[PDB]
Design a protein around this nucleic acid. Structure first.
Lengths: 79, 50, 51, 48
DNA sequence: CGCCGCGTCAGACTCGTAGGATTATAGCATAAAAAAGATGCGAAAAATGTGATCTAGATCACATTTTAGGCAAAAAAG
DNA sequence: CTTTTTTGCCTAAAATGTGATCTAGATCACATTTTTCGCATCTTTTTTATGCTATAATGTGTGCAGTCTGACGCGGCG
C-alpha cells in the first residue's frame, strides 16, 4: 500500500475522493486522537489512512454516519 | 541552499532570494500549471498564501 | 549540541513524510516529481536515474 | 489581564488602605517562590 | 474603393556577480519659535518612631549516676 | 608457681535531673523627615521665516537615439 495508491481508486473510483477523505480522516486522527482499526506498524498517519480506505472501512459516507450519530447523541445528552 | 523561515519583503511581506540572505526559492508559474494538470487545490492554496 | 536523539527523532519523523522535487524548466507536468525521503551522509541528493 | 494600571490608593479603598505591608508581602512571595520551588522554569527565560 | 503612412506593441523559464554617482549656482539683518538647563514646588511613596502585647530558654544547689580508672588481689592461663 | 588480666572496690568525681520562676526579645497598624522623580514657569539660545541688493544685461536645442520589427489599427489619402 505504501508505494502504490492503486487499490484505493478501484475501490472508490477517484484519486481526488481518496485524497480528500484520507486527509479528513487522518486530521481527525492527527489532532483529534481517535484510535485506528487496522494495525499501526510504525508509520505516519498517511499509511493508516490509505490502508483503512483500502479494506472497506472508512469512506466519506461512513465518516458522515459516525459524526452524525455521535453529534446527535451529544445534542441529546446535553439536555 | 535551504530556507526554512526567516526574513521577508517589506512592501509585499514575501520571502526573499539568495543564500547570502537566506533566500527562498521561487517557483515559476508553469510549475503551477503542473498541478493545474493534477488538481492539488490545497497545496496550491498553501504555497499561494501561507 | 547535536544530540544523537536529534537524528533518531529526525529519522522518526521523516518516515512517511513525502516530499517534492523540482528541476527547471518545468516545461510539462513531469518536470517535477514527488518521492519518499531517504537520508544520506553527504551534500548530494541522489535519485532514481531513469527519470 | 487588563488594559489597566492599578498600583496604589484605589486599591487602598477597594481592599485595604494598608500599602507597605503589601511590600512585606512582596518579600513573602519571593520567599514562597524563589527558593527553588518554581525558579527552574523562569531560568530558561533568564537567557532572554 | 484600395491604397499609404504611421504608429503600437510582444519578444522561454528557475538560479549566481560586482558596488556605484555627480554641477553650480550672493549677501546681510530681525524677530520669531522652539530645545537644554535651573528653579521650585518641595508635593505622591520607600526609610523612622508609638507603647503595649506575647514568648522560649536560663538558672544553682540539690539529689543520682555514670565514668573512671587506679590499684591490688583473685582467678585463669602459661 | 608465677604472671596478667580482669572486676570490683576504693577513691575520688564528672554528668544527670527538679521545675519553678522571670526577662530580654520581637510584633505590631499607623503618623512623620528624606530620596530625587514629573509637569507648569523662565530664559537663554539657537535656529528659522521673512525681508532687500537701484551701471548694465532680452528666443532653446545640447546631447543623445541608433534607427527592432511584423501585424494590425487607423487616419488618411487618395
Amino acid at each position: 500500500a505504501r508505494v502504490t495508491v492503486q487499490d484505493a481508486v478501484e475501490k472508490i473510483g477517484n484519486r481526488f475522493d481518496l485524497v480528500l477523505v484520507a486527509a479528513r480522516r487522518a486530521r481527525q486522527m492527527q489532532v483529534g486522537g481517535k484510535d485506528p482499526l487496522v494495525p499501526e506498524e510504525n508509520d505516519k498517519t498517511t499509511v493508516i489512512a490509505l490502508r483503512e480506505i483500502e479494506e472497506g472501512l472508512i469512506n466519506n459516507q461512513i465518516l458522515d454516519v459516525r459524526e452524525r450519530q455521535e453529534q446527535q447523541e451529544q445534542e441529546a445528552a446535553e439536555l | 541552499h535551504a530556507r526554512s523561515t526567516g526574513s521577508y519583503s517589506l512592501v509585499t511581506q514575501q520571502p526573499l532570494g539568495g543564500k547570502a540572505q537566506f533566500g527562498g526559492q521561487r517557483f515559476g508559474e508553469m510549475e503551477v500549471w503542473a498541478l493545474e494538470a493534477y488538481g492539488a487545490a490545497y497545496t496550491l492554496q498553501e504555497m499561494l498564501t501561507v | 549540541r547535536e544530540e544523537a536523539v536529534v537524528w533518531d527523532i529526525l529519522d522518526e519523523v521523516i518516515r512517511e513524510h513525502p516530499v517534492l522535487l523540482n528541476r527547471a524548466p518545468t516545461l510539462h507536468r513531469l518536470g517535477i516529481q514527488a518521492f519518499e525521503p531517504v537520508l544520506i551522509e553527504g551534500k548530494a541528493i541522489q535519485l532514481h536515474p531513469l527519470v | 489581564d487588563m488594559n489597566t494600571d492599578y498600583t496604589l490608593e484605589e486599591v487602598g479603598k477597594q481592599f485595604d488602605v494598608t500599602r507597605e505591608r503589601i511590600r512585606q508581602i512582596e518579600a513573602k512571595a519571593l520567599r514562597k517562590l524563589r527558593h527553588p520551588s518554581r525558579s527552574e522554569v523562569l531560568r530558561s527565560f533568564l537567557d532572554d
